[PDB]
């Protein structure tokens, strides 16, 4: 209704918005309107991906409208608010950016040319064998690449993410004598009744995984369902709905319900001396965990540890 | 010569003249992306 404040709305602005914002009010004929529109929606909330180019070419259906139509649209478009935007492959975006530097920066454009046009494939490790590429030595190369490493990434200064959706918690988890006790802090009713059932089910947990213990204690949903004699599918709802808090490593619980999370923990234990060797070892700690006991033999578990985002492979 | 006096003229109207066909306005429409990106306005006045 009106004469008050409902949560009609806010109309805030993203980063596409922004973009067909700035569209508007540029220069643009009919048809490379038609492009610009084509590309700001291929561009992310991350910035730099433009995604794939012969595809915006290609959207469009012939009829003429070469590649180079959309290079020149597309490099415009690439040179709008946030400074590089868009582009693709994060070179071209530091060539972007690096565009502007006044031209004024003592030793920076050239260098800072080849650096970044080329060979920084190479760059990621260190300089090494790249300091006799460029023949530049000592400070020099350096301080371009001081630079170079103070460009920042693509946008992500739109965001418009100002909220962080938090968590509210749900049932809180007062710690007793090294363990967990339940509080549940913070028709309808019958709906009210299978919540409290549900944090009692999470009580049950506390005595279903050891919270001292690395990770959780393997369980079943058989246990819960064993318990209150509620169905899988329910028990699974309550947890995946609400989150269950605790004072240390609080959650919706939902995932706890000592397993793979145990050889997660031992994974991290190797990733803290994985250190040494790059490459790292899960297929040898699988070895380990059949001398264990474990019995992985170059597994999954032990691709867990050489998956995660881990050095393993991506050293390799 | 130089920028600006080239900078105001509608494809339209730069589009015909001998020599310059479909492609050379694609090439002047990329290099002049960079940089300026303007091709157009009514600006004001000039020094020269």
Same mark, same amino acid.
């Given at each position: 209704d009106d004469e008050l404040p409902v949560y009609q709305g806010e109309t805030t602005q993203t980063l596409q918005d922004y973009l067909m914002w700035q569209v508007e009010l540029t220069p643009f004929t009919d048809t490379d309107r038609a492009i610009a529109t084509s590309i @700001?929606? !291929?561009? +992310?909330?991350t910035g730099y991906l433009t995604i794939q180019i012969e595809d915006i070419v290609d959207s469009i259906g012939d009829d003429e409208i070469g590649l180079e139509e959309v290079e020149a649209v597309l490099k415009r478009i690439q040179?709008?608010?946030?400074?590089? @935007?868009? !582009?693709? +492959?994060?070179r071209?975006?530091?060539?972007?950016?690096?565009?502007?530097f006044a031209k004024e920066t003592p030793w920076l454009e050239e260098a800072?040319?080849?650096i970044s046009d080329?060979?920084?494939?190479?760059?990621?490790?260190?300089?090494?064998?790249?300091?006799?590429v460029t023949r530049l030595k000592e400070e020099v190369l350096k301080e371009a690449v001081n630079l170079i490493q103070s460009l920042d990434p693509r946008p992500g200064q739109s965001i418009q993410t100002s909220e962080p959706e938090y968590v509210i918690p749900?049932?809180?988890v007062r710690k007793v004598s090294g363990r967990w006790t339940v509080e549940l802090n913070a028709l309808e009713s019958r709906n009210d009744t299978l919540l409290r059932v549900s944090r009692c089910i999470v009580e049950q947990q506390q005595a279903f995984f050891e919270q001292g213990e690395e990770y959780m204690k393997p369980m079943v949903l058989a246990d819960i369902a064993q318990a209150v004699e509620m169905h899988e599918s329910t028990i699974s709802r309550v947890t995946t709905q609400k989150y269950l808090h605790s004072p240390r490593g609080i959650f919706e619980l939902k995932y706890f319900f000592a397993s793979s999370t145990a050889i997660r923990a031992l994974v991290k234990k190797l990733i803290a001396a994985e250190n040494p060797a790059k490459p790292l070892s899960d297929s040898k700690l699988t070895s380990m965990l059949s001398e264990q006991g474990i019995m992985v033999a170059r597994r999954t578990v032990a691709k867990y540890r050489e998956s995660?985002?881990?050095?393993?492979?991506?050293?390799? | 010569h130089y920028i600006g006096d080239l900078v105001q003229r509608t494809e339209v109207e730069l589009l015909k003249t001998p020599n310059l066909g479909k492609k050379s306005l694609t090439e002047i429409k990329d290099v002049l992306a960079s940089r300026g990106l303007s091709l157009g306005m009514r600006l004001e006045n000039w020094p020269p």
């Open positions: @700001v929606d !291929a561009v +992310d909330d040179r709008f608010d946030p400074v590089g @935007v868009a !582009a693709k +492959d994060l071209d975006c530091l060539l972007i950016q690096l565009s502007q800072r040319l080849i080329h060979l920084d494939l190479l760059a990621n490790h260190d300089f090494r064998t790249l300091m006799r749900d049932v809180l995660l985002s881990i050095p393993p492979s991506n050293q390799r | -």
